[PDB]
Amino acid sequence: GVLKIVKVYLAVKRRIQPGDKMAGRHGNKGVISKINPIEDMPYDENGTPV
Amino acid sequence: SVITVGPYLRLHQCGLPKKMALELFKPFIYGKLELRGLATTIKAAKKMVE
Amino acid sequence: KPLVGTGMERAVAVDSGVTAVAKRGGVVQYVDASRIVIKVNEDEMYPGEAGIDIYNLTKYTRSNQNTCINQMPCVSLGEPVERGDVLADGPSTDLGELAL
Amino acid sequence: QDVVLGLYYMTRDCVNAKGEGMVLTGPKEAERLYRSGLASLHARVKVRIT
Amino acid sequence: FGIDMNTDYTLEEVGKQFDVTRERIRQIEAKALRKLRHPSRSEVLRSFLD
Amino acid sequence: GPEEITADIPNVGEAALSKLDESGIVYIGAEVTGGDILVGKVTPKGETQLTPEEKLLRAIFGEKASDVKDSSLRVPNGVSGTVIDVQVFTRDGVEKDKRA
Amino acid sequence: FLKPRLVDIEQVSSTHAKVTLEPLERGFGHTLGNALRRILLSSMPGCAVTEVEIDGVLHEYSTKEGVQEDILEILLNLKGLAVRVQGKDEVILTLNKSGIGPVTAADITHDGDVEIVKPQHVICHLTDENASISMRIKVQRGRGYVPASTRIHSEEDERPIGRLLVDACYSPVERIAYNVEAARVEQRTDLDKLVIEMETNGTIDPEEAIRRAATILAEQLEAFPEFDPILLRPVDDLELTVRSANCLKAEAIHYIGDLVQRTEVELLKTPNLGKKSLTEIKDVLASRGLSLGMRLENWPPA
Amino acid sequence: TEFLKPRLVDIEQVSSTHAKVTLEPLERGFGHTLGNALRRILLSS
Amino acid sequence: RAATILAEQLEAFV
């Protein structure tokens, strides 16, 4: 019944957004809540954010 | 969908994703859109939100 | 790469077919994002046909989970390689180790 | 959890701290004393409350 | 056409029902559609076509 | 009737027909989002059987209602990516189209 | 009520420097300092590369023969290329190289406002004797982070599919840290110093950054229905032939509203419109319920 | 590369000695720096 | 007046 088939292959690039699931290797799961600016990030005396 | 925190919220509310609310209330949006006169007809409303 | 490792990740990365492993030791004649051609040392080499080991790297293609599976050369032009060394890394592998 | 650790760390006392033993007209200048780094969050203090 | 009516009627039938028959009626329609063709009339129906 | 992969699609603007080649298949490397037509497809459906108000509408606007329905493959809603590959399979004995 | 001002600016590297502020009253080192850190990290002019058209490349997911880097890798490398411009908001550069060896950032053609801070920077390597790469690197200037994904809404024919859009990294600032130490000026009870030690890519001078930062900071203190929509559509929406469209645009007809006002007489009097073109226009207008010589009286409202 | 200034400003005050003022449009992360630097100055100085 | 002190502090930059 099928005369001809056209397969298109899409490459989609997604980074990360709230709702994604992240976890360490220790069985500690989690879901990204909000994406915070570098400005609001807790930083050490060296000035390097986390 | 997956859920997140949103501590800023009052107890009586919840964060609802834009796209989701758009798709969910679609008939309401059509109705209001052609209620105020922003859309000629329901078809036009569909085309607008689409 | 795992900053905090175990020492197994190398074995998992290599033993799984994702990475491209040298068949025979030698020097690298050609290094491209496409292919990697290695000139075999005479000792490991067979008498007939002479020959060099040419590895054609798998490039961007559909995986079973609808993710991407792609190989990158970890070696540089004209570099010493040994038998059973990582010539190219697969997806989620760094220098013969396993980066998940 | 986080919230109760917050109110717990807030409402609590150590043996010695900044502004230990002093007196204040009310909660307003109590918080005003704390936020300026003059008085410790937990310190034994007599204050006038209504 | 069959608008808000059972089936639809041939131009001659419409002529019998109008007592003024044939080519005459065919003209009215042509000038009728014409009046509906130009916008402010046609802008509402235009959006119906996607 | 037989379905067509042709680039001729009932009721589409030039913006829609832009991303397709003459044969009706999206170009390699063309970035797409939801709603873009990847492969134009059309299937025969004759005598649409319209109604009175529709008949008036068509006679007013003078539009020929096509005997063909639009089955074209379009990017799923919400997903956006770049087309890196196209493969065409044809029944043995059926004439290959231009793109193929 | 002593106002602060700046003092020695110590440049330890092309990368980073420590700017210092002498006359600071009680506790003000922190109030000024952190607020300065915020604006410094967040809002600053940047020139990060946006668009890149390469040689034989349709998409960023291919590999070019002769280069061991994947195209996506080359884009990612370009995004980390630090350049500074003067008079131009957006400049386009041209990169060209061949033969065996690394292609650095100094291998690009040098323009008037182009300044390469890292000439040693690696864009991509070259693996074969005869293998050559040319590319246009379109570098524009902006603020904050502008991803490649949000870049497409306006669209407007980015059709040159060979052009790969890249995420905008606009910002000189890498790391900013501020330390207040007590600063003893000759005579005064007690004052503080502000040591802001910042990290940059070299594309912005410390005095300049520290200046604009407080410039913006103070700058915030400055406050403490008839007719058819189809008539306003551009003529391109009519999907005419290139010739007809160009002719109409040449006759000051840019929208459908302008076209429907014209008559056959008037259009035939134009230097470039023949009977074929007029037939086409009448056809496409009639196909959408429009025509020539249409009057709408009131052109235009607002 | 022009900037953003706030256009909807409303001061809703209770009684006389108390006040709640609000500012609608502020660029991302500007609300915290403004709010905080002003709080520090208001209280401490 | 509070934020004015701030503006005075910045008077040597902008």
Side-chain angles (χ1 to χ4, degrees), chain E residues 9-21:
Chain E
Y9 313 99
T10 119
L11 52 145
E12 282 93 350
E13 177 76 9
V14 190
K16 166 162 56 263
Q17 305 311 315
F18 257 4
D19 191 270
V20 50
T21 335

Side-chain angles (χ1 to χ4, degrees), chain E residues 37-40 42-43 46, chain G residues 228 288-291 294:
Chain E
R37 205 94 51 169
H38 245 55
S40 68
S42 209
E43 311 169 355
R46 199 182 306 270
Chain G
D228 186 351
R288 302 185 65 169
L290 301 172
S291 76
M294 304 199 9

Side-chain angles (χ1 to χ4, degrees), chain D residues 24-46:
Chain D
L24 302 90
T25 181
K28 294 177 183 175
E29 82 172 29
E31 180 191 61
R32 169 150 31 92
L33 251 293
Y34 170 57
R35 290 293 285 157
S36 58
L38 291 177
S40 171
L41 188 50
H42 31 53
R44 307 127 142 201
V45 163
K46 284 206 178 192

Side-chain angles (χ1 to χ4, degrees), chain I residues 1-13:
Chain I
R1 225 159 72 200
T4 296
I5 309 168
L6 189 63
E8 291 273 9
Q9 292 280 309
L10 288 197
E11 203 175 7
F13 298 109

Side-chain angles (χ1 to χ4, degrees), chain G residues 163-182:
Chain G
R163 283 190 170 274
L164 292 312
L165 305 82
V166 320
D167 305 82
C169 190
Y170 313 135
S171 206
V173 292
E174 198 82 295
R175 174 190 312 168
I176 274 76
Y178 75 103
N179 330 305
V180 298
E181 59 188 307

Side-chain angles (χ1 to χ4, degrees), chain A residues 4-8, chain F residues 5 25 38-39 73 86-89 97:
Chain A
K4 40 192 298 186
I5 292 175
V6 193
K7 293 190 177 183
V8 182
Chain F
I5 307 293
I25 286 84
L38 290 181
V39 175
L73 166 65
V86 167
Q87 294 296 329
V88 169
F89 304 158
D97 58 53

Side-chain angles (χ1 to χ4, degrees), chain G residues 120-133:
Chain G
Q120 308 90 337
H121 189 43
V122 44
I123 278 65
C124 73
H125 295 181
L126 247 299
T127 190
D128 190 272
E129 288 202 8
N130 52 323
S132 190
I133 38 170

